[PDB]
Design a protein around this nucleic acid. Sequence first.
DNA 1: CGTGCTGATTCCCTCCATTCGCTCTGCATAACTATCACTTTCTGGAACTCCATGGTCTCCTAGGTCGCCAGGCCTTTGCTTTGCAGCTTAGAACAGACTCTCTATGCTCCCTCCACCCTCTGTTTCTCCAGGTCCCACATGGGGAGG
DNA 2: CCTCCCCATGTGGGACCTGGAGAAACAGAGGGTGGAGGGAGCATAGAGAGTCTGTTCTAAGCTGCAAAGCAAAGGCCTGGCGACCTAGGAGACCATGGAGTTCCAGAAAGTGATAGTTATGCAGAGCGAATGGAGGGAATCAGCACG
Lengths: 75, 95, 95, 97, 96, 82, 79, 226, 226, 107, 107, 49
Amino acid sequence: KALQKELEQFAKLLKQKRITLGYTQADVGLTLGVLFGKVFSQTTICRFEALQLSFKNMCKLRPLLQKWVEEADNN
Amino acid sequence: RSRKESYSIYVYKVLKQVHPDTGISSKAMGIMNSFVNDIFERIAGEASRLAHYNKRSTITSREIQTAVRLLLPGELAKHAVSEGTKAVTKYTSSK
Amino acid sequence: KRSRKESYSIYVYKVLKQVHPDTGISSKAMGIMNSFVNDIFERIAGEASRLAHYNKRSTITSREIQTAVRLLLPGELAKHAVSEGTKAVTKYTSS
Amino acid sequence: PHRYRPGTVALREIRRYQKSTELLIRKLPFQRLVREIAQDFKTDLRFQSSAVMALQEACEAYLVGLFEDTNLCAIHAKRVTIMPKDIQLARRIRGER
Amino acid sequence: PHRYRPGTVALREIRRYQKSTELLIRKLPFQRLVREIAQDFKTDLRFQSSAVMALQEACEAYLVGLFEDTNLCAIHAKRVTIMPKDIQLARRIRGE
Amino acid sequence: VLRDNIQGITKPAIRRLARRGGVKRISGLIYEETRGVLKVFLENVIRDAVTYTEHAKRKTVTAMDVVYALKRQGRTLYGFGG
Amino acid sequence: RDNIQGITKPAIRRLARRGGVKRISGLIYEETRGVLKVFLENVIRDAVTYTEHAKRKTVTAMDVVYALKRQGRTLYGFG
Amino acid sequence: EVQLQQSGPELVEPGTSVKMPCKASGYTFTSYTIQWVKQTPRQGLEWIGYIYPYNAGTKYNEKFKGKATLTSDKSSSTVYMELSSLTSEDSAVYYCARKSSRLRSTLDYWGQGTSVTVSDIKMTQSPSSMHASLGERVTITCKASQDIRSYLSWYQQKPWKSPKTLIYYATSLADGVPSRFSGSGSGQDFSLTINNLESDDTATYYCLQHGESPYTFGSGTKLEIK
Amino acid sequence: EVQLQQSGPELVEPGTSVKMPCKASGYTFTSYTIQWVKQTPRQGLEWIGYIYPYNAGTKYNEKFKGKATLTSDKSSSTVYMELSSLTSEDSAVYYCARKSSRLRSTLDYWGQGTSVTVSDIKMTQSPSSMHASLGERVTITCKASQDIRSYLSWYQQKPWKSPKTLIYYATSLADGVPSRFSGSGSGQDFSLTINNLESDDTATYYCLQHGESPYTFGSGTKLEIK
Amino acid sequence: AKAKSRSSRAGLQFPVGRVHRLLRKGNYAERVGAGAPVYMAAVLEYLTAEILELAGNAARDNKKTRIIPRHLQLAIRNDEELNKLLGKVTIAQGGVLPNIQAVLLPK
Amino acid sequence: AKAKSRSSRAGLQFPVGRVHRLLRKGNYAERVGAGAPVYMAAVLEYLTAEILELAGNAARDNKKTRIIPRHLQLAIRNDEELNKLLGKVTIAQGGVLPNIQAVLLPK
Amino acid sequence: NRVRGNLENLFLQCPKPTLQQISHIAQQLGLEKDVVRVWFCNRRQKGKR
DNA sequence: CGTGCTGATTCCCTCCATTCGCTCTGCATAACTATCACTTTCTGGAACTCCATGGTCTCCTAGGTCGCCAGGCCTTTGCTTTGCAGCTTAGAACAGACTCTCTATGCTCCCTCCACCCTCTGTTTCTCCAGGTCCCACATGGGGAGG
DNA sequence: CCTCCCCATGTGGGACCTGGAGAAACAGAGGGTGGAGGGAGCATAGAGAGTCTGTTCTAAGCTGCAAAGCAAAGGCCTGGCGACCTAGGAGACCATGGAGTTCCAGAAAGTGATAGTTATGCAGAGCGAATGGAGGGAATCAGCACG
């Protein structure tokens, strides 16, 4: 109840920013692998924004896109 | 093998949207896929007949709205017409 | 300047004069006959279309029409209709 | 004077109306009923004569076939008088209810 | 000993078999019946397991609906026992 | 503005429709039930016919719309087109 | 090959108990066996016709589903 | 698959009535008419009548009205024939035959034939009898009186056996009949052609019309091998 | 077309039982549930329960369980409500309302209500009573204690009149309601906006949730103009 | 260049060309082989011939020489097969089959 | 430009593109008007959501987390409009409604 | 009778007087052209039988 | 002869242990999206013709009402007969496992057949007027009854 | 015996149905082209038929009896039969206005082709749902006792 709304909302702002800068899903996964050394496939990039996988797995990998979103704002 | 498509992920997304604690079985997913395919065939056949009656070679959202008014019973048809009109308005207003 | 309507009233009369030389027909009975021929045409053609769609084929052949006649028509009716269709196709692919 | 027993005229009426083909309801009350019913769906509608005619043959055929099913339900209950329970049972088995 | 009056265990069976969803005919006799019925149309043909299962589900659903209409006919005839005449009347009104 | 026209389906008309159906005896409460059943059937068929008419952007209900409505409800009618 | 006796008396009894039937006559079972045989022949004939059109020697669940459907007896849950 | 069971031979004294059953199995009983014909040495096969179990609709020959009545029992899947006031010329083999309600269809399957022993379109067959070798071609002519629009059938009958259907609709082969037999003709002139014979072709061949209301059989052609 | 006829007022002695009719017309009676709402000036509107005439399916509130009994009669198209063991706190107006079995649908058409005199989730509405001009903007909040999937409706009630449905599904307009009213919000936060005012809008506005099994109304806002 | 329409080449009276055009324009399949209208016209012609011949016989046993829809209804409803094909079909001005249940007759 | 889909444009979960492809290749018309799959997908999503919500409510009243076809049958048969839509439809492993006629009960 | 003789003068001379002769003869007898046409049609029908 | 308080059978609810179906996780891939050209297809607009309301007149036949009464429905009651409840024995189904072998699906070659297009033709559809035939009322003849 | 009225009948003429003589206009059919849908081989995984064994589990058969269906009888009550009145339906004849069809323009838009990119189907681990077993507690039901 309380967890899902946060993740579902956060998926909307990050995709809106993602579209504006013209990147791709593969490009975002490419940047995440460069930054934290934990590469993510393009499939998981889409599965995040469409909410395919577990709400537990939303909790685990959420801050990495949180770090990317704020860092993509600066560059 | 040969990649046969279904509506399982779509019905599961709808289920987790309307009941974010409730799962589903494989058999109930088969029932839901059969339901979606059957209603698709009914609405598409009624819209095809509606286009054929009026000497039209295209199926638009007006044909789909009239077909939904034909197959579905009263409040079911009213809410489905509201949902379809809302979706077409949102799709037109946003590319 | 209004456009023309088309029907089976000319061919149905020819078949009538074959099967009954001294026998007329009313206009209402011709309307019943036209509705009957149209209804059976849509039934067999839709059935054959479904048969071609189930088998992932893109063409309707005489095999699909034969199977649709077998599924739609009851026993001896389907047997004699298959006989007539086979004889006509054999006669057509010889000239 | 001379009087017929009950069921004798009622059997000759069955033999008379089953061999005839025309409509059994008067045309103008059925047309007025059709226009009254259709005015609740769309105002200022205007039917053709053949539309009301087709509606009358459809309704009369449906009512006649329901009356045969009602008669079968009445005979199953060891009766010859059809009752509203027979109509309800026939419409229940037919899927109309 | 203890013995239930007639109609009590019948109503218990009605409640029990209306509460559950499992199939009521054994699978092997229905499979043999399906194979012998299909023998008159094809001399040597195989059957998927799902095909026989779908046939069993459809046949049991048809028989349950026909028994519902049969019970309605029996009650309309002021009875609680279903007779073959009730089955014949129900299949006549249904158009079968 | 028409009102109370189901009473125009008179008791002798229902009796004639029962005689064509093979009915010997008719109870007195049959007629109101038959009027209700005929009314329900008429609103179903007329509602489908009016939907078919409004899709065609017409103010005139044609016989062909009635034929499509009857075909839709599984009561196919011969002799009025199609 | 017989095998209509495999639809036994308590199986028809269970199918009637699911239908809400309290008391069953003794002549119900043979009538029910004939009814089930007629229905099974009507469905299986169309299923075998659908199988023979596909040039197959195996009746699939899809053929049974299409056959059922054509009789106005649409079955969900088998594809 | 399709069987038309019948009873045995009935010895009957004149004056009373006799019953013949036609218990049918292997098909939907209500969808096919049951037709009764009789066979005598004196005049051969002749059609008596039929009974349609779908509506129990009877139709009799004009010379058999009153002499023969037909009833049906749908529950037992049986067709019963009553003959009343058996005269001296009633010792005959009585056959019941399945025939579909379609006009093209004919008496495809027959009963065994009950032997009863008592204490219009004219069919012209030009060869009454003929002899043939083991491999030649035989032609049998069935010129008719009036016009029948290809509604002719050809039957083969072994001695002391039921007739076997060969040709229906004047050209089409029956079920199980090989391609040696070939029907031809239309209108009033019809013919049956046997291509190469066997030892099983020694039989009596009949042609039957069902274009008019009284069905008439042929005079019969006897074919004897070597 | 659609109307729900209710009886007159009742002056009942305590300890007895009272019957309430809800005769219905203008629609297919079996396809719509009938809900019952009690209205007191101290607790506001309280949902009691509903009857489904399709299967005669009952559902009651927990505080009205046993005290209230709902029945249906499909022959006369009537819904009956039984109150037994009348406590002195039963002097209230009882409305019966139509509501479809669809989850999106709401209590759309209401009855006139019978005035009876004896001789979960909580909606918080922030303005209890507010004053507006002839052309001002009115915004009413209906903050919910729990989460509902946009299953909130907005109703307007005149003094001594039945409530009128304004908004269903928290954004959609009711039938016949002008587009001046506009609902917004989802989840736990909802709002109703009156665009421009008339003299008709002097009324009390309520919000009802039907996303969970006990249906709860709001406290209500009194809006009077000039 | 010449004669020989497709109906005359198949020995039919129902139009093979019109049936091919209706199969093409009826939105049944992407392609239509040129044996399907022949088979389809033959089946329609056989069904028309069977119903018209039975209705002509029904008119002939009515001292009439013109087929009315009553004769078509009498032809269709008196046959097991035909009734089964057209079992959910209403014929306008056709009436019903004349039958009375046996328990209604007086004795 | 990042290739956003049509379902997210319409705010749906059911696929607009797959429904467009099935409408195009399903032999229904010569053309598909590109707002028709949006309407179709919305109607299918609404019907799926209504059935799934009623089935989840039935599973919750049955104290079960998972939906089985019994819950779908109990959801469909208890609703008049849903049972009218699927009157000629058999749900596998769904059973029947608990319904004993009132005459059959004792006393 | 005089008009009858004037009309019956043309039995075997003009079997089909047509409109051109009919309009000329009708003014002479003071009768409508339709009456003359109907009379000549009836005369031709009587001659046919 | 009317409940009444033991006793028995069944149904519902609780607490462990899988375990097997579900959710979730990763990868290839094809299909869905963007963008550009281009060919339909609908959407106003104006003309039109045509057809379905809508009213009037007559008459005359079917509908509404009333009397009346016979037979058909309803209820009662006894009698039989026929399913149901229960117990015991056995035989048939269900489950797990291994063979095979024959089938269904996939890949390639390629080829034949079917769609596209132009042309010309025979076929199909819609009225329109002369002619033939049927009914119908009017003038004429002859018979019957009255003075 | 003379005269007036009424019935049977011949017949001229108006109206209805048909057939011919056109009448023309959509469209079926032939023939050339090419490309792609699907036959025809050719291989092969896999799954369905077959057999086998083992263990319960349910069905078949028989007995006792209660209660359901059935048939005879009487009451009554209601639906059919018949007659008198009368009013509304049916058929025809108008007037009309507003509705549905048609042609022209073209702006919108749906299709096709190509690139790409992404989200979706498929294969496989982790796990929490639930299913059965043991146990307890309550709902319900149906046969002797006291009054």
